[model samples]
Each structure stands twice: as C-alpha cells, then as structure tokens.
Target: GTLFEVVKLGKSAMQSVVDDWIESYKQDRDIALLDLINFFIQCSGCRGTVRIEMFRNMQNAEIIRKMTEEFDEDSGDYPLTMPGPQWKKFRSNFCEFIGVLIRQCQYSIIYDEYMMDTVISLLTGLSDSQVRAFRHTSTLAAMKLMTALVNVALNLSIHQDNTQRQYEAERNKANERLELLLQKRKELQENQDEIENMMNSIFKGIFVHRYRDAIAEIRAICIEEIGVWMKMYSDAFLNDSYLKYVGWTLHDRQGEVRLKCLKALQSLYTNRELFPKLELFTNRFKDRIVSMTLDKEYDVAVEAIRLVTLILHGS
Candidate 1:
C-alpha cells in the first residue's frame, strides 16, 4: 500500500496542479504550461519489484540509490532524468518528500521562496517542461499541516506562560522553513529570468491573486486560532508582559519563549489590520509594531517592512 499512498499523494497533487493550470490557461493559453498529470500517469505503474511489493520497498534508500545511479549512466549533465530507474523509478520514495515540497511552493507565495529555485534546478538538470511538471505536481501540504498544528496549540490559555512558550518554539521551527524557502528563491533569482517572467505574468495584473489570497487566508486562520489563546490569556498584565518580553529579546538575553512571542507579533503584522484585534491596549499595539521592527531575524524585519508599506499605501 506504500506505493498506493505514494501514488495517491502524487496523483492528488497532480490533479490540483492540473486544475489550476487549466484555470490559468483560460486566462493565458500562450503561457508556458506543464501538465503534471502526464508525469504522474507516466510514472504510475512502472514498478520494478514483484506484484507483492511491500510498502517498505517504496522507502528503500538502496532502491532509490540504484535508480539514481542507473540514471547517471544515461542522464546528461545533472541528476534530472525520467521517472524510470533513470528518474521516476529511483525517486518514487521521494514522492512524499516532493509532495511536501510542492505543497509548500503552491501555498507559500507570501513567505516562501523555494518554489522558484526548485523550478530552475529541475530545468537546468532536466528539460524546461519537466521542471514545470515537477512544480505543478508539488502540493501545499506543509502550510496545511502547519496551519492545523498552530490552531491546536493556540487554543490554550495564554495565562500559562508554558502554553505560550510552546507556541513560540513551534513558530521558531516554522521560521527555519522560511529560511529554506529563501535559499531556493535566491538561487533561482540569481540565474533565471524566465521564472521572473512566469511569476509576473501569472500575478502582475491580478489584484490579490490566488497565491496572495491563499497567504492571507492562512494567516487569517492562524490569527483566528490564536484568538482562542488570547481569550484565555489574562490581559491583566498583558501590556507589561508584552513589554518585558520585548526588552529581554532586544537585549538578546531572553529564552525561546520571549523570541517566539516576538515572532507572533511579527507574524500577525503580516496582516496589519489584524494587529489591533490581537492587542486591546494602545500600548500593547505600539509594542507589537516596535518589537517587530527591532527583531534580529531577517525574515521578521522584512515583515516589518511590509507592515510599514501596507499602512502607508493601504486605504
């Protein structure tokens, strides 16, 4: 059943990509389009093991290795190849891995950058169409998973510093995902113009397009979920507590809890209008903005930049 699960994720991701492509094509048919269904169908039943193939075979590192090696014999410059032992056959175990990756790129329009790089990596090593196929097939599962986890954690009472601490720790880990995203984006930007053209073509005219809406929706859900935590959080000392957390973090002497609290403010600011909702006190509101500006993390600072731009430009 591992193959089924693997193929299922791959197929599900493929269908999503195909449907979106069909939708995008309606607007711009001339635009470059990659049909992931073609790849999924192509790779579906090309199994090497027996009819009684175990789920373990789907995860066999050696099988993957041998597949890659087999591809190397015929694959040109880089590691890119077909879905056979030369490509797909060897990399099937990575289906889930690639599924996780696709899910991220599809939904991470606002914060993640890895999507572009993933495209180029596929293109340079494989064909342009193949790369498109890869991206088109990638799902947005990571964001979905993160969204579900954050919702559950933020349902607790904020009066318990431990509960808040746990939330921050998870946010910090999510922040690392942002780093991975940026790394991939930087590589693509440095070497590719086609990608720039592709993204701009897709988003340049649509005001708050699908990707933008998806980002907003994800953050909105997060803020709403955290509202549950905020209700449990006694605001009796919230102003003072928020300030103290900021001070300790600015001094670089605070624990992960303090940093996470700061990150939460910064994240909330991505949807600036939501800020006032989270902080009832004027002092709490100002502190939230100020702490975000001075955050040491580069990603946090970019968020602050966006906040300022939104306030100045937004109606």
Candidate 2:
C-alpha cells in the first residue's frame, strides 16, 4: 500500500500545481512553487519505487497519468527554481523497479511458486466487478488469467518434469488466449464515441497540435505507471482502451513513446506462447524503423537500433 500511496500522493501533489496554473492565466509559471516538494518529501523511499505500486489498483496509474499530462515530458532546468524534478526522478526510480524485477527473474525467484504464481494470479483475477472497483485495466487483469494456467503447468512439472521451454510455451498459450479474450471484450465495449469526442475537443482550432504533444507526454507518463503495475503483477494490463490506444501510438508514430511501446511488447514476450505474436508486432515495428530510416530520421534510426538490441538481448 505504501507503494500505491507514493504514486497517489506524488501525482496528487503534481496535479495541484498544474491545476493552480491553469485556473490562473499563467503559462510561464514555475512548477516548483507548488506543493509537490512536500509530497515528495513525505513519500520516503517509496517515492523511488512508486511505479511498482502504480498498478496495485488501476487508479494508481491514472494519478501518474494526470501528473504526466501536466509536465508534458520536458525535464528541463528552470531559472528560478528546480521544479522538484518529479518526472525525472520517477523515470530513474522506474528503471530501478525494472532492475529488481529482472533480477528476481534472473535469480530464479520469479520461477518459484510463491513469487511467480502469486504475482500471476493477482494479475489475472480482476473481473468486471473488480475492474469497476479498481477503476482501470492493469497488470492485475493479466495476472488474474495467467495464474491458474501457470499453476496447472507447474504442478504437472512434478509428474512429467517439464522443460523450461515447455513451461514457457504453456504460459505463452495462456497469455495469448488472455489477449484474445481481452480484445474480444474490448470490441464489445467499443469506446469509439468517447475517443471521437476527445479527438474533436483536442483538435479544435489548431488544438490538434496540442493534442499530439499532450499524447506524447501522456504516453510517457502512463507507460511508466502502467509498467510499474505490470512488473509487480508480472503481466500487462489487458482489455483496456488505454492499452489499445498505446498500440495505436506505436503503430502511428516513431518516437520515444514508440520505443516505450516496444519495451511493452518485449516484456509481454517472456512466455514462449506470447513471443510468436509479439514477434509479429516486432516485425511490424521493424517496418516502422525502416520507414524512419528511409526518411533519414537518423536519430530515430539510432533509437530503433537500440530498441532492437534490447529486444534481442532480452530474448
């Protein structure tokens, strides 16, 4: 809960700053003058690990998104004050959380029944009622589905001695099935009307430009928060419009957000069953990289190369 609280308080504090500025007529207001200092100051070590707790309930991720929208991803040095470095600190701390999860996987703790299954079950168990209660789709959605099937395979291993690859294959199948079901559910819910309204509102009278910029900012922030939840839960959030919209961004734009989306796919590919479809998406990603290369976006090319390297090494 401390983890959840850190994200909640940090975001709440950050929003209060942005809200204050918007209410007034100050576009150049210093963000540091806000209460964010107190929020971070009171958060303790959990501040650094806030992302890990962001998905404890889906609302946690939303708070992070709110703050990200306010900052818009530029962690610059201001003249009057430091502006508290909240987003920058959040990014660095997020990396720490990923490091820990990777270490757990590397040391075989992630393969244990308690850590792996507990985490997986937490992901797969969130239902429609739970979704309403939790208020967002998150790693908990994935965990709720993965845990039972994972346990079945783990138990079978005692009798048949399943290989690592075999278990991975099983997990992947379960994950793929989950993704399919999630997509189907999404198709049914279909937030097309809401999406249209948001787009129209943001795109009005050159507001579209602002919308695009805000999307980049929003993507960066939401991904970090959602990712924190996913790593802790050991799965991606399934069947959410936000998650689907993220995929659309990766497909349409070639930027840092696109790279983050690649990381998401890479994370999901851990199970062998999930990897093949992930590879399908990665292939599409490669096509995007090639498109950027042809356009002579050299910087983007470099980012793409780095992403490919990470995916290959991680795999």
Candidate 3:
C-alpha cells in the first residue's frame, strides 16, 4: 500500500517509505520481500482480476503498471551512503521477483510498455552495476529472461499463425464467427512484433555492448544468445553485420568465450538456411578457427575442430 501510496502521494515521500521497508525487511529476515515473491509464485497463472491482500481485484499487468508508473526508468541509482550489502540483498530479491513475474505473467507483458521498461531498467541496475556479486546472478537472470521471452514469442507466433490461417480459410463459411476471429487474430498477430521489436530495440544492451564485459559468462551469454537469435529471429539477425558480433567474440582473451563463439557458429552453420548467411563470416574467420584446433584449452580445441569439420561439410 505504501508503494502504491508513493505514486498517489509524492516522490518526496518515496525515499522514507522505501527506507522503512528496507529497515523492516532487514529486521525480519527479508520477510517483506520474501512474501512479495511468494505472492507472485502462488498466483503464477492468475489471468483475471485477483482478490488478494496486496491489491484487491487487480490483475498482474495493472499491478506492474502501477509499480513502474511512479519512477523514471533510470531513477533507481544507489547512493554510496547506503550500506552496500543491504542494496545487494534487495537487488537479489527484486531480481527474483521480476524473474517470477516474467515467467508467470508473460501473457500480460507482450505489449505493456511500462512493465517492459521497468524490467529492463531493473535488470540494467543489477547486471550493469559495478558490484561483482551483483553482476553475476544478474547476468544469468538476464539470459534466462531474454531466452524465455524469445521462446514465448516463438510459441505465440506458432500457435497464433495456425489459428489465424485456419480462421482465414474458413472466413467465407461463417461471417459472424469471422468477425470475432479476425478481431482476436489481429491481437495474436501483433504479439511477435512487440517481442521482436524489443529485441531489436535493445540490440546494443543485450548483444554488442556486452562484448567488453569482464565476466566470461557474461560475454559467453551474448555469444550464445546471438546464435539463437540468428537462427530463430533470422529475418533480423541472420546477416553478416549482425553475425559478426558472435564472430568478434572468437578473439576474446578467455578460452570459454572463444569456445562459446565456435559453438555458436557451429550451431549456426548446421542450419541449411544459416550456413549461407555465415559464408562471409566464415571466409573472414577461417584461419582463426583452423588455428583454434591447436588451442591450449583442450576442450575448446576439440569444439573448434568439431565446428571446423561441420563448416567443411557445410561448404
């Protein structure tokens, strides 16, 4: 209620209210935060209005919509005066809350601009923070959320496309049903575009910007995810310029990252439609992969060899 009150009242009062919440949760073993996460878990697939304690007769989208309405996307910066671990713990709790919400309430998220912005911004606060401990879980959190979103959008597309196609073919047979079907079909058809637009809109945040990431797993995720995008979101990502980001990772100082690059390329090259798109990248990086067969990291070397063999068979 105080959180909702912040939006109702003023930002001037938000700090005190949040600080009290921080103190109370700190006093009670993070129960304040834990219960909030618990609420979402218990109500995972709640589609319509829920008559719950937090906010009666409200859907997840509206709850999320209100949650973000009070603050600008970049407004969550931490002050040095604040205790480090306190914010760190809160970040973990909040990230888990966001993760659960995204996983369970994805049906409401596709077109909700405020909730999407809030999620990405909070993720930035965690994953891009200067704190090492903060960045690790946040990085994986990001990967899971992005991967889930892509998979969900793909599912929505497949499910709806069949429905839409089936409806279109039968439109002439039933005029009244056609009216209802077309209305909802457009709704379904628009979903993939929203998800696609988010990926494209945040291209730098998710892909290229993280290339300089100090964490091996961080850079590894970008490489791995780019491969998935290149194949599934082929219309936007299956181009030389976009494919080159994954290619560029092959030169990363870390062996795991380089291995991720090779494996990503390996997977990409295996797709008949994808191999031709990689022709330009492969030609440019051919020498590097061949030399990678002699890489000091035996694991990477073997994968490199496997990828090279796949590349050879493809061409």
Candidate 4:
C-alpha cells in the first residue's frame, strides 16, 4: 500500500527518495539503497491485483526519466549533492530496472531519448573503478540492457518504418554511436591503465564462467569485445594470458564462439606490432584451425581458412 501510495504521488515522492539516497550515500560511502532500488524493481512487475496502482504509476514518463537521468557534475554542490559513485549505483539500479521492464513487464515504455543516450555514454564515460564497483551480476545486467537497447534501436530501423531512408538513418546513427564509443575506449586504453585492466577483468570473468559451458551470450560478447580491443592495443591483446585463453576457445563446441576466437587471431595477425606474435598462435592453435577447416559448419570452415591464410602469410 505504501509503495502504491508513493507511486501514485509520482515524481515528487519518488524524486525525494532519490535525493535522500544521494545524501545518505555521501555520509556512509558504503550506503546500500536497497529500499529505493527494491521499490523501483518491484514496480517493474506485471499489474497483479494488489500492485496495479503502482504498476500504473510506474509508466509516468517524468518518473522514468528521473530514474534514468545522468548526474550533472557541474552542479554547484557536486559530491555533496551527488557523489560519482552514488551516480554509478543509481545507474546500475536504473539499468536493472530497465532490464526488468524489457524482460519481465513486457511494457512498451519508450526510454527517454536523453536517457538512452546517457546509458550508451556510460560504456565509455564511466571510469574503471566505477565499473568495478558494480556487483558482478550488475555488470552483466547492464551489458544485457545495452544489448537490448541496441536491438530496440535496430528494430525501430527495421519494423517501424516502411521507408528505406528512415530505416538506414536510424541504423546508421546507432552504428556511429557504437563506433565513437569504441574509439573512446581505445583512447582510454592508451592513457588509463586501470580501464584496460578493467576490460581484462571483465573478459577474464566471462571466460572463466564459460568454462562451465554456460552463458554463451556473455561469453560471445566478451570474445567480440576482446577482438575489437585487439585492433587498438596489440601489446595488451597479444599477451600470454589473453592469447592462451582466447586460443583455447578455438575448439569451443559452439561454432559461432570458435569463429570469434579465430577472427580475433586473424585481427592480431594484421597488426604489425603483433604480427610476429602470430607465430605463437600458429604453434598453439594450428591443429585446432586445421580441425575447424574440416568441421561440419561451413561458416567456421570459411573463417578457419581465412585465419590460416593470415598465419601462412605472416610466416
């Protein structure tokens, strides 16, 4: 009843709790805004009889906007009003709520244009420590939300418009945003060792978890991200630890995952700084590639040939 009551009261009440959490977070450094996040998450469920009012109120655009809004660092009060970490926690909660809305509620509540931009911005803008502070589950949750958001934008480009021009424009804008973020990440890797290490940690965690043969989606994303990152920083990407783990994936049961590992190696072969290192991969993964060439999947066989070609040319 209290939750419904607050939701019915709308942004005024919800925003107060948000501001209060920020205030409390400053003093406690380790504050857990459990009540606040739990309430938002609960509001994301279907309109069961008792929660109907809260569910109805959860659709308010202003309320959702506030929940997803980015903290303005330029505010005069700064951390006293909104610490950076507090903002990180807020964002993590906001993303989790969005994931619930998309996955559980199945509501067509369009994200605020600015809110979606902010979510995309976080991929490049947030510091490594800020990302590291998120619970491991939260990191994956946020990643899933990003993937969903990208898909949403893609669907708009495909299904929303019959006109080809509009479809291409929407799809192109989303791609451009991703390219810019990847560029920013490349720069971060160059200047910020911590961010590079953060990327490594995320990859390592996903790779370790996938050893159980679980979460193909997360593992696939990690593999793709590593492959992209390799284009920018060969030194980091070609290291023994990453190469060994990535090399091991060549024989992955899933042909798609195995293909990504091969592509990552193919990318490394093209980088002059990393070209010599291809010798190590050839020695370590030659048999695996040879096997892939004869594998049942035609696509994997094709990529396997391409990778082997790169290795032979490098030699």
Residue pairs in candidate 2 whose N, alpha carbon or C atoms collide under 3 angstroms = 123-140, 123-142, 123-143, 123-144, 124-143, 124-144, 124-145, 125-144, 172-273
lDDT of 1 by residue, 204-306 (tens): 2221122222233322322332332333232321244333433333333222333343444444444545545444433434555556665666655565556
TM-scores for every candidate against the unseen true structure: 0.22, 0.31, 0.66, 0.43
Off by over 4 Å in 4: 1-191, 200-207, 210-213
lDDT of 3 by residue, 1-315 (tens): 688886886643334444454455446533544444333322221222223453434543455444334333443332211357655555445444444545454576346575465445544554554444335444555565666677677778777888788787887454777877777788877777787766654565644566568878678867877777666667677888886777677888899899888887887878776776778888898888899999999999999999989988887
Residue range 201-252, candidate 2, lDDT tens digits: 2223222122133335434434544433333333323324334444555554
Location of the lowest summed lDDT over 10 successive residues in candidate 1: 203-212
Predicted model with the maximum lDDT: 3
Q: Which ten residues in a row have the lowest lDDT in candidate 4?
A: 126-135
Model 4 residue 165 CA deviation in Å: 45
Q: What are the RMSDs of all candidates, in order?
A: 21.1, 17.4, 13.1, 17.6
The window of 10 residues in a row where model 2 has the poorest summed lDDT is 126-135
Give lDDT for model 3: 0.62
How far off is model 1, as Cα RMSD?
21.1
